[PDB]
């Protein structure tokens, strides 16, 4: 807000993904670092295009601070933005809801067990129950 002076370089528009790509630069003295959501809000309020169509990531701060350089993406529409953006980036932005999956070790263990079990398995469960009953 106080003389951040967000600026953009190497702005190239590709209709192939219907987006515009650039390297963005922020000159923000007396700051820790400019957050990506704050950058998105600034780009939205200065371009009057869209809120969720602006992507900013990377953002290394120069040694001694005061300036940061990162990568920025703007999208033709929110539909295309959600069609092309990575799921992790969308979730980190908050545009997407996080998935509920177990650890990879548990998933691989489960795949091993269900490759050991052939078919549906209900017949095996019923047979085991009857064997216990007898």
């Amino acid at each position: 807000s106080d003389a951040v002076t967000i600026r953009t370089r190497k702005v190239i528009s590709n209709p192939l993904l219907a987006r515009k790509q650039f390297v963005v630069d922020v000159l923000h003295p007396n700051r820790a670092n400019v957050s990506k959501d704050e950058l998105r809000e600034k780009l939205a309020e200065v371009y009057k295009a869209e809120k969720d169509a602006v992507s900013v990531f990377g953002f290394r701060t120069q040694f001694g601070g005061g300036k940061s350089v990162g990568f920025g993406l703007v999208y033709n529409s929110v539909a295309e933005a959600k069609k092309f953006e990575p799921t992790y980036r969308l979730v980190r932005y908050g545009l997407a809801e996080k998935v509920e999956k177990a650890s990879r070790q548990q998933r691989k263990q489960k795949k091993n067990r269900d490759k050991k079990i052939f078919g549906t398995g209900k017949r095996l469960a019923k047979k085991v129950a009857r064997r216990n009953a007898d």
């Binding site: 003295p29 007396n30 120069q62 040694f63 001694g64 601070g65 005061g66 300036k67």
Partner: protein, 184 residues
């Protein structure tokens, strides 16, 4: 797996560990240029030997050789970029006889003492190591920076540095606040 990342040494130990004259020379040089180790002298001597070997291998080739002309032009261009060679003499004697004294007196830490920004070599050294130096819009804390005459118009203190301004300092704020509280 991944391609290896090449790493090279930057210094060389003398062949004789205890030469009285060499030890006196190195200690005097490091005392007058404010160096922390003989490894700095070793590094600068290493690059000096590297460039002298380059010059000798260039003079190896016949006169008016395209590779000789190109490579000599590149080496002299870098030497004048770092600013040691004459801007109007292409006589190459300095090229064949650059000196450790020249390299250190060109190095950054002594540059501050030469231009008069710290008035002491060690005070300079401690200023760079405490990062109150900015060659441009960037802050460097390395004494061995070897400025290239280009930032001379732009040398200043950082705006995120105390005694550069807009900030009292970690102990300055405490001392001023306690003085104000005591004075009432």
């Amino acid at each position: 797996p991944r391609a290896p990342r090449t790493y090279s040494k930057t210094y060389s130990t003398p062949k004789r560990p205890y030469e009285s004259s060499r030890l006196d020379a190195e200690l005097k040089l490091a005392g007058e240029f404010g160096l922390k180790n003989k490894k700095e002298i070793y590094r600068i001597s290493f690059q000096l030997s590297k460039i002298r070997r380059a010059a000798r291998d260039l003079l190896t080739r016949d006169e008016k050789d395209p590779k000789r002309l190109f490579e000599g032009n590149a080496l002299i261009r870098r030497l004048v970029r770092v600013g040691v060679l004459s801007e109007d003499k292409k006589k190459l004697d300095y090229v064949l006889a650059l000196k450790v004294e020249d390299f250190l007196e060109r190095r950054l830490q002594t540059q501050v003492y030469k231009l008069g920004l710290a008035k002491s070599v060690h005070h300079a050294r401690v200023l760079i190591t405490q990062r109150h130096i900015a060659v441009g819009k960037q802050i460097v804390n390395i004494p061995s920076f070897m400025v290239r005459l280009d930032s001379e118009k732009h040398i200043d203190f950082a705006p995120t540095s105390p005694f550069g301004g807009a900030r009292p300092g970690r102990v300055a704020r405490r001392n001023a606040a306690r003085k104000a509280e005591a004075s009432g």
